[PDB]
Design an enzyme around this catalytic site. Structure first.
Site, PDB file in Angstrom:
ATOM      1  N   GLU A 139     -43.131 -12.164  16.590  1.00 37.08           N
ATOM      2  CA  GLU A 139     -43.602 -13.025  17.479  1.00 37.08           C
ATOM      3  C   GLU A 139     -43.244 -12.588  18.875  1.00 37.08           C
ATOM      4  OE1 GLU A 139     -42.267 -16.741  14.220  1.00 37.08           O
ATOM      5  OE2 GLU A 139     -42.671 -17.014  16.383  1.00 37.08           O
ATOM      6  N   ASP A 175     -46.126 -14.496   7.645  1.00 37.69           N
ATOM      7  CA  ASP A 175     -45.173 -14.494   9.081  1.00 37.69           C
ATOM      8  C   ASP A 175     -45.379 -13.259   9.865  1.00 37.69           C
ATOM      9  OD1 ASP A 175     -42.910 -15.434  10.397  1.00 37.69           O
ATOM     10  OD2 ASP A 175     -41.831 -13.535   9.674  1.00 37.69           O
ATOM     11  N   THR A 176     -45.930 -13.460  10.939  1.00 38.50           N
ATOM     12  CA  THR A 176     -46.020 -12.453  12.086  1.00 38.50           C
ATOM     13  C   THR A 176     -44.928 -12.232  13.018  1.00 38.50           C
ATOM     14  OG1 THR A 176     -47.245 -13.953  13.564  1.00 38.50           O
ATOM     15  CG2 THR A 176     -48.546 -12.648  12.128  1.00 38.50           C
ATOM     16  N   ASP A 181     -49.875 -16.195  14.717  1.00 43.20           N
ATOM     17  CA  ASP A 181     -49.671 -17.106  13.617  1.00 43.20           C
ATOM     18  C   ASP A 181     -50.161 -18.513  13.953  1.00 43.20           C
ATOM     19  OD1 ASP A 181     -46.069 -17.553  13.437  1.00 43.20           O
ATOM     20  OD2 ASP A 181     -47.502 -18.162  14.852  1.00 43.20           O
ATOM     21  N   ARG A 232     -51.043 -23.798  12.267  1.00 39.90           N
ATOM     22  CA  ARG A 232     -50.204 -22.712  11.773  1.00 39.90           C
ATOM     23  C   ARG A 232     -50.801 -22.001  10.612  1.00 39.90           C
ATOM     24  NH1 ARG A 232     -47.325 -18.924  10.005  1.00 39.90           N
ATOM     25  NH2 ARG A 232     -45.340 -18.754  10.157  1.00 39.90           N
TER      26      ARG A 232
END
Length: 135
Positions: A37, A34-35, A15, A29
């Site tokens: 992590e 939302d990936t 991200d 960003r």
């Protein structure tokens, strides 16, 4: 909204990417996604984290053109990171991740919500096809 040129410095995570923009290094960003992590000693590495990070890395390293598109609200966050939609050869990296089941649509804060409808559409399709995170 308009697209401006930039140059890759290094991919960091699924991200986050570091780019040269207007002659200066900055961390970006990716807006609205939302990936899972790989960083943080929080949980450390989450399932599908290495995969999302490799996806982003290959898409920007292999591009001939990178462009950044700011939304119509603030352009940096509290950590100093640029907030934008990133395009590799004309394709939006943010949408690509969501279409592949490698990101969820997340943190939608007006007025930085211009592509929200489009990304929710892509996320529904990835869920329907049961891809990766949605498997």
């Amino acid at each position: 909204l308009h697209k401006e040129p930039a140059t890759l410095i290094k991919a960091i995570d699924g991200d986050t990417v570091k780019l040269m923009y207007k002659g200066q290094p900055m961390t970006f960003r990716l807006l609205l996604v939302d990936t899972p992590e790989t960083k943080h000693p929080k949980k450390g590495v989450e399932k599908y984290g290495p995969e999302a990070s490799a996806f982003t890395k290959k898409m920007v390293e292999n591009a001939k053109k990178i462009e950044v598109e700011f939304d119509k609200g603030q352009r940096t966050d509290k950590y100093g990171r640029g907030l934008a939609y990133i395009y590799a050869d004309g394709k939006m990296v943010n949408e690509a991740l969501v279409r592949q089941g490698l990101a969820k649509v997340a943190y939608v804060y007006k007025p930085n919500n211009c592509h929200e409808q489009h990304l929710r559409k892509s996320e529904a399709q990835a869920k329907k096809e049961k891809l990766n995170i949605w498997s």
